[PDB]
């Protein structure tokens with residue numbers, strides 16, 4: 001199921017055209033709202049007095065059709081950045097006219113070209129139009145992977161084409177887009193319509209568009225090959241790009257005339273459909289989180305807040321996660337109770353943060369398969385979940401499990417535990433204050449007691465994503481710091497982004513913490529070798545944890561626990577994007593700060609340039625103790 | 626009101642070309658309104674145009690007529706908005722205009738077309754940035770060149786060299802072509818060029834106008850600020866010492882001499898001036914058409 005559109009520059013009649021387009025299998029049509037060659041004068045007589053009508057009548061389509069089927073196209077003669085003043089004036093007036101007519105029709109999107117380096121005036125006119133009434137209409141900037149000048153035939157004898165590699169030069173079109181949208185102050189209504197050429201550029205040029213708001217891919221019919229049967233197809237390299245683009249769920253646009261005249265025109269579209277049908281999405285985890293892609297979420301604070309019923313449900317819908325706990329407990333019971341003591345040695349297990357009881361059951365299943373005896377405590381401070389635990393305890397668990405409705409830091413245990421099990425970790429590992437909770441519960445762990453998890457570590461990686469930068473930016477609220485949205489982390493299924501360096505460890509914690517001088521504050525410096533030209537918008541966070549020995553949990557991509565759904569990555573944004581060149585190093589600083597009330601993070605970028613310190617004194621974000 | 630001839634002719638007139646005997650060929654486009662199409666007309670009586678009821682022949686085209694040109698005495702080569710190059714031919718009776726072939730080879734609007742010396746091949750320019758060499762007999766594209774980096778504004782075949790022709794584009798290139806060379810294009814040394822015209826009596830000499838209203842005489846430099854807007858076209862007169870007619874988007878027609886000096890000025894048009902054609906019978910009569918639907922017959926003082 002591919003959403004595709006047909007691009008035309010010639011429409012003798014809208015009704016007939018739209019019908020032929022729909023019958024061929026297209027979802028929408030890109031067409032001009034004024035005739036492409038109908039140049040119009042606005043200042044000098046007598047041409048400015050040309051009698052109307054200036055274009056077609058809106059009555060030729062229903063309101064619903066204009067809203068859903070038509071994509072307007074700026075007339076190609078409109079050149080706001082022409083070096084001739086007269087042409088700039090006329091183009092400005094014509095641009096507003098055509099744009100306003102598009103808004104008049106309620107068109108869902110409008111196509112404007114980025115076919116040169118200087119589009120300053122073009123951006124000004126567009127920006128002016130955007131700030132003339134609040135509308136949801138989109139603007140698709142048509143920009144090619146490879147500038148036409150950089151793909152022209154080498155047929156000019158006295159002006160040969162370049163044959164030496166110009167790394168940055170081959171990325172020029174991205175700079176066209178970057179400057180245009182920066183001039184437009186990152187307007188959420190301005191997206192990319194990436195046009196694919198017959199010959200693809202280097203991978204770095206293509207990767208440049210990672211994280212950009214690509215809404216459409218344009219495929220000219222002239223890039224398609226021809227198989228034995230005579231149908232249009234694509235090279236394996238182009239197929240590789242189409243597959244990457246399907247992961248972004250862009251809308252594909254077919255432009256150009258039919259060059260495979262032996263076959264009908266839906267042939268090009270059929271190939272897209274065919275390619276769409278031929279791909280593989282990892283079981284569940286890509287099923288699972290397809291709806292949560294780039295969706296910002298507030299990180300849980302299960303300590304300061306009491307989690308809702310369906311939030312625990314989400315925790316429990318991950319069997320791989322808890323079977324890892326079961327195995328971790330299993331291995332530990334055998335290591336602590338020799339075979340000859342399997343009937344006399346009863347181990348005291350304590351779930352610290354039992355929720356609705358998935359760890360409790362995992363502990364029971366662990367003792368069975370290990371053929372050992374355990375005495376269970378189910379500690380949980382969220383009283384609403386203690387309702388679930390105690391109904392479980394009366395109906396099933398029985399006297400073997402003791403539910404304790406208390407905070408693990410204040411609970412006065414009647415005895416000491418052989419094994420404490422906890423699931424107090426967040427996307428950034430310690431961002432829910434698992435160190436502080438386990439520290440306060442440490443007194444009722446035996447001198448040889450084991451803590452599961454035994455240790456965890458958080459990882460950071462610089463990412464580029466103008467899309468996510470805009471979503472964070474859009475999170476301004478009425479009665480707080482206008483920039484507070486940049487000084488707090490978000491749990492998000494990072495999708496449309498580009499990871500600029502390999503993740504590196506940030507903060508690590510061990511339990512039990514035998515050290516006499518426990519200090520959970522942290523200060524870490526990281527240097528990320530970046531081998532590409534990009535723009536830094538934030539840092540992605542992951543975590544790894546050791547439940548016991550070799551049994552582990554991880555959302556770090558290179559060591560991701562296969563099949564585990566729980567825990568999306570966390571995102572630490574930065575107020576201002578930072579340009580980074582190839583070979584430069586990104587130096588980031590992170591602090592874990594705390595007082596008696598709150599714990600929080602502070603971060604700053606020191607290379608290649610200095611950012612402001614983010615979330616100083618937890619002014620914008622703190623974690624409740 | 627000949628047969629299979631539309632009752633109404635489109636408003637925007639784009640092409641006007643005389644032939645040997647003196648019949649006038651008209652190309653019209655509908656650049657606004659419900660239907661955006663075009664048409665072709667033949668006026669054996671040039672004074673009866675653009676009246677449709679007193680024309681020799683006529684026919685409707687599927688899309689607009691961006692540019693056209695004669696192919697001999699009965700052939701018409703059309704640059705269509707649909708991205709196709711069309712060849713129409715009059716019947717033996719010259720009362721019907723029939724479509725000979727319509728090939729969709731360009732991926733965008735075909736804006737310019739020109740017939741080469743031999744009269745058996747033609748070169749076309751399009752907004753898809755391509756330039757194609759056509760075999761009118763085999764109805765196929767012999768060569769497709771992507772030498773420019775922007776729209777191809779104008780392509781003009783050499784008068785007597787069948788392998789040479791000019792082209793200009795919005796990439797600010799003026800390319801002299803010689804398909805006899807391995808690399809057939811050559812960049813000839815401002816504002817964007819918009820029109821081309823070879824000299825009929827001098828091999829290596831041509832003129833070209835720019836988007837700023839300047840006309841320039843170039844040997845393979847003399848120039849003059851002729852117009853206040855884009856120079857749409859340049860047509861040399863058939864005289865032994867020819868005159869130069871320049872039309873522009875400023876709604877004016879100019880007639881220049883050997884040194885680009887102005888000898889005549891017409892403002893009869895109220896809209897853009899799209900073409901100009903000299904009468905083969907009366908050398909001092911110059912016909913122009915424009916988007917004001919006017920067919921003006923100028924008497925140029927010589």
Ligand SMILES: Cn1ncc(-c2ccc3c(=O)[nH]nc(C[NH3+])c3c2)c1-c1c(F)c(Cl)cc(OC2CC2)c1C#N
Nearest residue numbers: 297298299300311314315423424425426491566567568
């Ligand atoms: C938004 N957010 N922040 C943190 C978490 C989360 C997720 C899973 C676990 C877990 O399995 N154990 N322990 C903890 C805490 N110790 C936990 C914490 C989430 C979160 C959430 F609270 C909900 Cl309701 C849904 C989520 O994503 C679903 C759609 C895929 C997430 C995430 N990510």
Ligand SMILES: CSC[C@H]1O[C@@H](n2cnc3c(N)ncnc32)[C@H](O)[C@@H]1O
Nearest residue numbers: 302303353355380381382407408437
């Ligand atoms: C499975 S998510 C973390 C679980 O542990 C609980 N929890 C967090 N902190 C504490 C604490 N200090 N004492 C007891 N339970 C806790 C939370 O209420 C939640 O159910």
